[PDB]
Design a protein around this ligand. Sequence first.
Ligand SMILES: O=[N+]([O-])c1ccc(O)c([N+](=O)[O-])c1
Ligand SMILES: O=[N+]([O-])c1ccc(O)c([N+](=O)[O-])c1
Lengths: 115, 115, 115, 115
Amino acid sequence: CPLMVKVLDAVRGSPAINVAVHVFRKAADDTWEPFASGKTSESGELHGLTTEEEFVEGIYKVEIDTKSFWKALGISPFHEHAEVVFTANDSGPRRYTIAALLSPYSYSTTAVVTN
Amino acid sequence: CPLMVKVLDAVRGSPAINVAVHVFRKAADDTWEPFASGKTSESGELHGLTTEEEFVEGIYKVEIDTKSFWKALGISPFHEHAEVVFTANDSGPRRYTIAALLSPYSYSTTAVVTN
Amino acid sequence: CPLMVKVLDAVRGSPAINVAVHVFRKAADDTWEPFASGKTSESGELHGLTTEEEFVEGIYKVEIDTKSFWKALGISPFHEHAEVVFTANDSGPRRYTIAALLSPYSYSTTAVVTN
Amino acid sequence: CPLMVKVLDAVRGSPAINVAVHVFRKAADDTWEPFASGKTSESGELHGLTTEEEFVEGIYKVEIDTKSFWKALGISPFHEHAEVVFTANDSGPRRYTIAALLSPYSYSTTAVVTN
Ligand SMILES: O=[N+]([O-])c1ccc(O)c([N+](=O)[O-])c1
Ligand SMILES: O=[N+]([O-])c1ccc(O)c([N+](=O)[O-])c1
């Protein structure tokens, strides 16, 4: 429950369901290593990506596959995906919610970080 | 200028053109009195709303007619309009740009205040 | 549970707690009548504003008192409040979540509407 | 231009000045190759990144160094940078403006594509 991703559809005003999400962690060699992945639920939320144990300090990238989402709705969107890159757990364990609000030519993303 | 309004469309990735914008100033009896208005240009901008002489300190409301905009495009909108309420404060020479980025179920607005 | 308001702080990445929220409904005479009010909880959410019975079809305005919020944190923000105006229940009862993400000079608002 | 990047600061309500921006183009081996870069101007804009002749169809990544920007202002940021990944498509004469509105824990980005 240390990492949750939530995705909303700004065109319909609904959760964005079945959106693929891939998480990567920067490795010693400076490459992006696969870390976890999943798909948003009917609530637009993706829980269970990781555990407190596995979610160590590091630089992480959360890639939200927005293009596939929009194309499945008949929209040709601008972005390939939405990417969120951040250092995590540098001051000890935290809980992170990464939210993205999606439109065809735009998105917003915010993080809520709690102890 | 001392006041400009800019409106963008997040669905098509373009300026929002011909959007009605109304500006009001708060009167002593607490009511909103018409102050200025117009329609956004081909660039999505509305210039020439007021002059330095007219734009005195006070509380202003900028109402952007987002519902009509979405109606013209055949897209079902949530909001009646977008409203931005702010106090104009003299603090050296300032220009206010009110920008709004529109989606059918969401909008973002920011103020850019520069000398 | 037909109306919920959620407010997030984009400066700290946390829920916006104890934020005053006032809801109004447009009356026959075209004036804004008080409808409900409350303050966000530790989760940044405001539940229990109304009931399915009281929340009839109409035009509603949700005013989020952002200025008071920011001033309590030592910030002099741009907006007086964030206003969200929308027609509700025109096609029958729905559940509405109105979210606002706050920064000193900017905000975004989105609605998630479910049946 | 065919490509412009604009960055705004939602905390102070101003252009984000002297922000580093790097543009990459996806190569055949799937790697990101440097394409163009610069620092935003006093208007928060970065012009002259590329020419029509150089800006061929392909996948591009625009990375805005938001962390350094927030560091210079003494404000604790969440993201390492903001990233915008998109496919450039020839479809009549197009100009791309990538805009980003920055907060310490959130950002919004939109594309404005015009002839
Ligand atoms: O969590 N939210 O409900 C919410 C609201 C507005 C927003 O702009 C965002 N965002 O940028 O991710 C998220
Ligand atoms: O440039 N702008 O005017 C502007 C306004 C609001 C926004 O949310 C954005 N954005 O997403 O980058 C840009």
